[PDB]
């Protein structure tokens, strides 16, 4: 028994419609998308940064590792 012992609640009214009276995916352009954008916007500067930093470190380290495989002509300039 977990329904009926949860919380003391007073004076709240709620209104809901059957699913058959309403649309499944309403106002995609007037409400949905705007909010999607809103949600993306509010988070991008928190998430993106470290991932971007990760990428850099990755690129550096990958290129630096290949550069060290190449040869330095300065080791053969007096090998005649």
């Amino acid at each position: 028994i977990h329904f009926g012992n949860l919380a003391r609640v007073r004076h709240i009214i709620t209104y809901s419609l059957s699913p058959f009276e309403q649309r499944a995916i309403p106002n995609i352009f007037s409400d949905a998308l705007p909010n999607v954008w809103r949600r993306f916007s509010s988070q991008v500067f928190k998430v993106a940064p470290p991932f971007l930093g990760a990428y850099l470190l990755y690129s550096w380290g990958t290129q630096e590792f290949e550069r060290l495989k190449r040869k330095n002509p300065a080791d053969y300039e007096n090998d005649q």
Binding site: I1, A7, H11, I12, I13, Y15, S18, F20
Partner: protein
């Protein structure tokens, strides 16, 4: 104009719910109903017959657990509610066919 009886604009029915919650109240009331046909329709005779089968109850019905109404019996056997009633409220072009019961907070679910 004066002796013409005006026809009212039809009222649209909506499957939906309204929940007014006040845990401070001692017992809960619940009413459920579908759209009825309206005065003129003959089916109302059958609906009323139907409501008679389910009928009604209240904690002072002496018949108790032997009442013919199954819902009434269960109500007694399982202490499902303080009372319940069926109804077929009619109107010109529509109506409400349903039931209402009064139960303790912890027996609402089984009653329904």
């Amino acid at each position: 104009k004066e002796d013409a009886v005006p026809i009212l604009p039809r009222c649209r029915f909506t499957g939906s719910e309204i929940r007014a919650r006040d845990d401070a109240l001692p017992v809960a009331h619940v009413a459920l109903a579908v759209e009825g046909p309206g005065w003129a329709d003959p089916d109302n005779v059958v609906l009323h017959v139907a409501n008679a089968i389910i009928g009604r109850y209240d904690r002072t019905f002496g018949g108790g657990k032997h009442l013919s109404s199954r819902l009434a019996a269960l109500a007694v056997e399982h202490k499902l509610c303080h009372s319940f009633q069926t109804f077929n409220t009619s109107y010109s072009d529509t109506g409400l066919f349903g039931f209402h019961f009064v139960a303790d907070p912890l027996s609402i679910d089984d009653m329904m």
